[PDB]
Nucleic acid binder design. Structure first.
Lengths: 62, 60, 60, 62, 60, 60
RNA sequence: AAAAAAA
RNA sequence: AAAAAAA
């Protein structure tokens, strides 16, 4: 199920950990996980931006 | 759950937006409408963007 | 749907379109027909394009 | 539904039309449609090769 | 319907194969096993290839 | 499943692995955990990798 | 739209 | 692993 993905993202969100989100094309976005659902992650770095999970390679604490 | 309100808020306030595609290309315009699979992005003309091709949507 | 009426209008009105693919290649032609997964695009040839390979459909 | 895709491919198969299959990375394969199902197309050009539909951009008569 | 028998025939006859990935990379070895989502390709070691990453499977 | 036993063996035996991504980048580490959609890979950092971005998992 | 950069 | 080639 989502027994890894949801607790991993929730912890980053709860703890306001700065993250790097690497996209599948190698572009690295930085910010905080504001929220997420089945399909998207909202990545906040003053501005809120919506990232499709389909375009993400990895999520790592910065 | 979060996708629709995020896109709608941009449409509602006519926020100029950037849509970055999975291949790195940046498209700019206004969110005119959206459904399960697509976003209509308006500039001079309305073009239909497939969600599967999008990496991010962000105010410009 | 926003997608289906958009494609149907383009198809019925025989509107010249540009289809941009995920590899950056631009196809041009008229939308001859479409279904859940594919679009039939006609120019000098008649070609079945998978929607998963499309980024955008733009009136030319 | 598959009201376009299945009759398009079946006609190519039935009529033994030489086809070009462009992959999503721009590589062009050539051969005849031997058969297909939900996920793959078998492309025959003396040898039978299995092509995942997820990797295909377009199918066109050659 | 066609995928499983195609892969199995290659495994059964120990046919040396090429698996071409969506990014153009060619992997070579023997089909050792497969399930809904992956193919195990054996050379010196067995590596697990995700089907979503594969364009084609062909005898080498 | 062939996938789950393969990943589980790698995880339990703390086998160093190379994960090749769709963009050609090679990650290295140990499989800390996995579920339907993601793998947690640990090296000097602990990183959640989406399976859709992975081409292969190779014992290093 | 490089019959295909064991990455 | 180019905070991102209106293609």
């Amino acid at each position: 199920g989502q027994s890894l993905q949801d607790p991993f993202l929730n912890a980053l969100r709860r703890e306001r950990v700065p993250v790097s989100i690497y996209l599948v094309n190698g572009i690295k976005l930085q910010g905080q996980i504001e929220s997420f659902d089945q399909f998207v992650i909202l990545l906040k770095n003053t501005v809120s931006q919506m990232v499709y999970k389909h375009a993400i390679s990895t999520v790592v604490p910065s």
